[model samples]
Target: PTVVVMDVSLSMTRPVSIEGSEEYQRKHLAAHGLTMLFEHMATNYKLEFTALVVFSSLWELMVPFTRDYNTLQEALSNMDDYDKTCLESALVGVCNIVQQEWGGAIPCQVVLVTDGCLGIGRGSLRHSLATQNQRSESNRFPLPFPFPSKLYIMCMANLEELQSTDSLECLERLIDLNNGEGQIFTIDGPLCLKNVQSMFGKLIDLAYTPFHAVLKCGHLTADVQVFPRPEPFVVDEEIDPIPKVINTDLEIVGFIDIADISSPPVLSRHLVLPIALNSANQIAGKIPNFCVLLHGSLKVEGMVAIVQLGPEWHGMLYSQKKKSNLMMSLFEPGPEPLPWLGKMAQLGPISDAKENPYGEDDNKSPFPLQPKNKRSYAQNVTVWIKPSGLQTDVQKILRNARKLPEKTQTFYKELNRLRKAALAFGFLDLLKGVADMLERECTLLPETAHPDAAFQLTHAAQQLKLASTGTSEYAAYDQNITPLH
Candidate 1:
């Protein structure tokens, strides 16, 4: 049996439009939708039972779980819209009904239809609803499988403004956690009421198929083979083996080439086989020098390689010290400590000297003024194989420049002369001079001065020295460019 909780609030009583004088049009429309649903359920399976719970400022169990669809329809039709909506109390009330009435073979479900708005001063109702949801999740594990149930919330309030309320958000979160669904469908007028039956039909379908499955990494196929034939092919014949004292060495290499099935086919580089060895003398070493290339018609291709050494030899001599020395050159040391700027007293006397006459305003000073101690910051760098295109581009540019004709080489020398002249006449030099003046102003005072004092002193020095923003030669071009432009 399913329980349908309906909201009968005062807002629902308002006439949908000037044309319709009836004040309970919303309630009547909901009743019609429920009746249509009931007629559809009649043709299906039996044992279809229902319960009705109407909620205003308080909850009322108008009907218990029963197979009487007619009584359920009557209760829905009798509902008027003149009470405050109390969604939290309504849900808690429904949970109690399900535990009391339908504690039998029939499956229990709930359908809460409201505007998703709760009245003020309903804090306890909110907490009770949360407790009910937590208990529902814990009880799901002990059953054969989670029960088939859903909560359908049809909010009739303003779609844009309703979400601003905390109660509305809490209802949404509760629906998400309990496998219930919510939607905001606005009612324009009486003309829009004709589609009420269709809307309810869609809701029923969504409740049945709560979720859909989407497959990832669809189907796959591959081919496998082994090499080195022991005997010739014979049709329906059992061949006997001939033993001989002959020795031979064989090598096996495996490769994997992946192809993307997308519109633009992407081909991955071939992965080369790693050598594994077993020897008669109980000595084995891998041969690492091997490569595999993959070619694709419509996509880019790549290669992978390895190098190996065969078994049947003494261990190869390798230099660990040489490797360590090579690695040391790529390491970088840690940052150096900043120089100490001296105590706060070195700057000037404290501003609040009246409170502490002996310059004992240590509490007012920024503690730990000295910089951090120096420590080793060496870190090892990793090496990787360089790509081919960058190496080729650098070599081609250098080679072409070196092989220029004598006349072309003479033009290159003149180009350097013009470049040097342009640089000398550029605004860059003037900008650097101004930057040097600012740097001198920054370091003019010792460590004892406040930041505000330093700023004032620098501004005064710039005005006294008549330091223009830049030299006149550069300022001419700077002013020529419009500030807005």
Candidate 2:
């Protein structure tokens, strides 16, 4: 069940009202949209319930969570435009309704449609709103056990007005905090009502099909399609039949190299791979390890490697001694037990056990195979590998430099000169150049040209050249570093 907390303030009665107008025609149109949502839910899913809360100075529960559309419509029609816009009080009342009356049976949500400012009894409306937000953040109220399932805010005020208003900004921030998990939307005028309906439809669709859809690389020119099963796919379970044609030329790689990121490795579950194409259109070897809640799957044709940094490699620094020793040992071909290598080996089996807990559970003993709990911890370093072409280019550059000692010295001098120039110009200047370029070329700009077009075009060309040849890595390391015990 979702709860809609609507603002019935005096401002909402104006011709340019958030609900459009109280006139029967306008109210009927708004009601029609609500009816569409109900019809969709009733036909597609079981047990759709709704609650309505209309507010001005105080709050009133027009309808509890019920399927009776007639009762709900009657309640909505009865709502009158009132004096004050006590948004904070309204929210409190809403929270109480879900907590006390309904006992929070189903998923709850609050859709706040407003155009006017918040009216707090005393003190700045900003502070009052912030306090409410803080309470929401800390999960102060427990009775509405799960809280509103989602929050969709439709601000009818102009963008400029909403941005300037402290109350609106607070409301916006609250919505952002819970989007996907919740949502917030804004509309400038009645014309945007169609967009709102579309948005709501999409949200409902997402709620029903919670699982993500994804594309997987097969071989050659063919690709596979992998969708998450309704129930989580156990790793040890017979590999599900490939739903679509998979090419043999291309191989889709899972995040096998990265260890202990999370309990599961399902698509849209454990890992996020950030890939970019080079001049040859070959996928870059470097991949970002951040986790993203993907909405669907992607398809690719060609050899695919899941590039991820292993846990052991994450905090490791450049070790000249280890590198030299490993090289020598490889040539010598002597059997030696390396402690680090042993630890690295342990990581794979442990991570596998963690991801496939069912497999681990079968071999029960005094000591468990993996850690019981997962923690949210991220290594600061941006770890990624160069693609074969980039790697070859770098090696070739080094090899040529080694042959010409004078040229090598000149290279270092040139590098230093660029570094000094960068410092002189300020790092932000370089960042601005990059950002401006990306905004112009990569981003979809507004149809009409802006004044900065010429500068943007020139900067983009320059940056693209630099990006193609640059080898240095950029990341921020914590200055107050602490060594792991």
Candidate 3:
């Protein structure tokens, strides 16, 4: 969900005086902010995954995507301080790691902690974007990352220093390349634990908010939560685009065999956790927990519950063994969920239907239905309506003509098929076009070709023009004109 890239360049070691305390390095300020971020995430967002990386002229993955914060905190303290800053290299490293692990679809947050200097040389962010339009392969900077990503540049320098170096504009320019899905964070007031910690604290609050919901089944109701909060599914249709919204109350309609509920495509999945409210005394203490009953019934019976997320929107509630305990998961918003089983509303048991339950020998079962047959209007049947198709056909016959005796029968058979189709369709021009092409091939015959090829081409060309004389002449003429024996 997040990748933290810390700049360990020599510039980060430069001392900055905090009015009331001893001088502190910019790296130390960044380390403190990162430490606070990890602690907050560990406590609040335990499920979210994070990675840590350190970069200077080159980058190293200090920690891969993981939920364990202890490893990240330890890795932070022992990072190797390297040479000058290279934002280009750092971004390329982040892009590769994220694409390899989480793919391009997952939303990622990149926290780049750096001092205010865009280091001098080719690898600097300033130089990278400056010569970006050049044709040289070396000038390419991995900007506009190949994924849904948000960058947060936590600059440790004061406002005055940032403006003096013009590093602030450089960082903002980098953000512009990513369609402005980023922010440049700087210390608002004096550099202190309270000020630095407050900035990182705001980020934590923005990303890790809790999602709550209620699960309802007739008279029974229970408090629940959906992790990675369900967002609206927006269909981008050219005619009319609309968003499918999920209701607050997830209502269970009925149950079906798990085998019958074949896995359908889903917009997103969420871990449905049954939470006990402070008002649990009325439901939990009085009656057996509906969550417990529902989970056990689905697990033991090998069935899945159909849930109505909203009007024309449906989902599946299936029991799965995630840990030692049985857990229930939810799949969202399938309008035409089961294509094979037909419409969700029109589905019914075979016993309830009045149609012939058991047909005679003359009837069919229709168990394994075939896909609809496409009509010839927009189907795959080849109809050569172009000069290229006829040209290719003539070329194929010329190739056979050059080969001579071995393919003599095959060539005549193929030519007959072409002639019959052209005649049946009344495309008389094709016969004349093909005849002229064969006569040209005969005249241009290579020395290696057999004499039989020349004789056959001349005879066929004469007979084709003769047959095209009139409809009555064509009817009387031998359609399969054999060459001199």
Best by lDDT: 3
- Which is superior by TM-score, 2 or 3? 3
* lDDT per residue as tens, model 1, 54-173: 888788888887776777767776775556566666666666666666543334556666654555544333554555556556432111213334566665543435445545665566
Per-residue C-alpha lDDT of model 3 across residues 1-485, encoded as one tens digit per residue: 78998899998888877888899888888888899888887876677799998898789887899999999988778877788889888998999999999888777889888777887878887777778736438646676888778888888787646456666777778888786877888777677778888888877676656567788887888777676666656556674378677788888886666665667566555667666664567666676567777877777888777788787677877777355223334444445566654456654455676764335552544222233675676653436889797677777877887776667788776677667666767788878877887787777888777767667778778877776664666544246766655
Rank by TM-score, highest first.
3, 2, 1
171-245 in candidate 2: lDDT tens per residue?
665555553345455543443557557655665675533222222333222111222112221223356432322
- Scored by CA lDDT, what does every candidate get? 0.41, 0.43, 0.74
Worst 10 residues of 3 by lDDT: 362-371
How does model 3 fare in lDDT? 0.74
- Supply the global lDDT for candidate 2: 0.43
TM-score top scorer: 3
* Every model's TM-score: 0.35, 0.37, 0.65
Worst 10 residues of 1 by lDDT: 325-334
